From a paper:
14-3-3 proteins form a family of eukaryotic regulatory proteins that act as dimers, principally heterodimers, which recognize and bind to specific pairs of phosphorylated serine/threonine residues, thus forming part of a regulatory system with kinases and phosphatases. The mechanistic details of the GR–14-3-3 interaction were further resolved by determining the crystal structures of 14-3-3ζ in complex with GR_pT524, GR_pS617, and GR_pT524-pS617.
One diphosphorylated GR peptide was bound to one 14-3-3ζ dimer. The pentaglycine moiety was not visible in the electron density because of its flexibility. A proline at position +2 relative to the phosphorylated serine/threonine residue, such as P526, is a common feature of 14-3-3-binding motifs 1 and 2, and this amino acid produces a sharp change in the chain direction. P526 of GR_pT524-pS617 adopts a cis-conformation. On one side, it allows the carbonyl oxygen of L525 at the position +1 to form a hydrogen bond with the amino groups of K120 and N173. Co-crystallization of GR_pT524-pS617 with 14-3-3ζ led to the identification of two new binding pockets created at the interface of the GR peptide and 14-3-3 protein.
Author numbering:
A (entry chain C): 520 to 528, 613 to 621
B (entry chain A): 1 to 68, 75 to 230
C (entry chain B): 1 to 68, 73 to 204, 211 to 229
The structure:
């Protein structure tokens, strides 16, 4: 577990998903 | 030249979400000239799918903002388009120079010919009106050949056969603007696969079943 | 180039999640010498946050593999390559901050924000710092944080999000790099409590939960 710091981060369906 | 060191480094990259690096390793492995294993085959594909997919997603965003001084979006979209064409040409270069020619097993021939159909489909999505016909032709031609072979040599429940149907159907519906052909291709694949549903093992069922759920969703989506 | 066209293009890149493009746009704007507006400054920060953050995440992963024989040799080889990119990105930002962003800054709110960034980028260098230069790099991170901390105290109210974000980050510096949990816990508690009393903008609330999340994890 890493401590929190600031800043912080329709159609079609084809094979080989991401 | 320590291909295992590259197949290993490639596995390290995927873990670190550094697909550009992973692609560089797998492309070097392909360049040796030895036919890829089924494990290398799937690493080269995942690497390239993530690298080109980032470009496709970015292009769909910049080209959606273009629809609604937005000349800047058109310029950037041109940029992203060049990056995308460059990545497709790469994969297609590997496909013609090494993968397709060294493909001994039929399953790999279908997997490689399907990849060729997908990469030409991505080029078609961004093609100059002039070049578009030729590129569409190339994609359909690759998928048709993969199709014929999969029909001959694989069971309807094979995931490569099912994934080929899914992608070939999405090519007809979007690239060819043919809803009647696309729906028919997806329904047959689903129906033939469910006709032989009893064959799937407890361990390997999810591989074909997931693709089948997908054929159904496209069909549901296209019919409503 | 046109500084506003570059600023617009950076907004497009961010929407597209193309940060290296976003960073290239914002780096050019800063090089012009124009004082960054509270919008150009945020864009430059978000771009770089995401560039370096990708390296920081891959580093942790490739290290984790090292703690979890031929592969171990190759992982270190990869860990060093990612470290070199990370250092390079930090030094880029540190050059901008030191050389242009900090000197041009006139208002206190911007100066506190730039000095916090310098504390963060030195903190990232410290996480992968070579043992020899490790003491100098930590010294630099702390110094940047402390200088911003004092200025924050004398010019902002506790509720200001930049003052709050400064406390969060500076707290995490003490616990993670100085291994001084009482400071980090004590420093974090004071900002919350001061934030809780004035409590008179809802961006500060987001920060309070993060402070609460950390005192809690440390607890």
């Amino acid at each position: 577990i890493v401590p929190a710091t600031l800043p912080q981060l329709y159609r079609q369906s084809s094979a080989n998903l991401l | 030249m320590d291909k295992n060191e590259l197949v290993q480094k490639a596995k390290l990259a995927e873990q670190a979400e550094r697909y550009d690096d992973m692609a560089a390793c797998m492309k070097s492995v392909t360049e040796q000239g030895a036919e890829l294993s089924n494990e290398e085959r799937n690493l080269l594909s995942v690497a390239y799918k993530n690298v080109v997919g980032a470009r496709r997603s970015s292009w769909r965003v910049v080209s959606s903002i273009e629809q609604k001084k937005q000349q800047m979006a058109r310029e950037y979209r041109e940029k992203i388009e060049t990056e995308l064409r460059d990545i497709c040409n790469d994969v297609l270069s590997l496909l013609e120079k090494f993968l397709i020619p060294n493909a001994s097993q039929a399953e790999s021939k279908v997997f490689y010919l399907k990849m060729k159909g997908d990469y030409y489909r991505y080029l078609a999505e961004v093609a100059a009106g002039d070049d578009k016909k030729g590129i569409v032709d190339q994609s359909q031609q690759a998928y048709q050949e993969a199709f014929e072979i999969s029909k001959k040599e694989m069971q309807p429940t094979h995931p490569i056969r099912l994934g080929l149907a899914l992608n070939f159907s999405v090519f007809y519906y979007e690239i060819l603007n043919s809803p009647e052909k696309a729906c028919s291709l997806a329904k047959t694949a689903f129906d033939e696969a469910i006709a032989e549903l009893d064959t799937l093992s407890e361990e390997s069922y999810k591989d074909s079943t997931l693709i089948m759920q997908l054929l159904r969703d496209n069909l549901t989506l296209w019919t409503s």
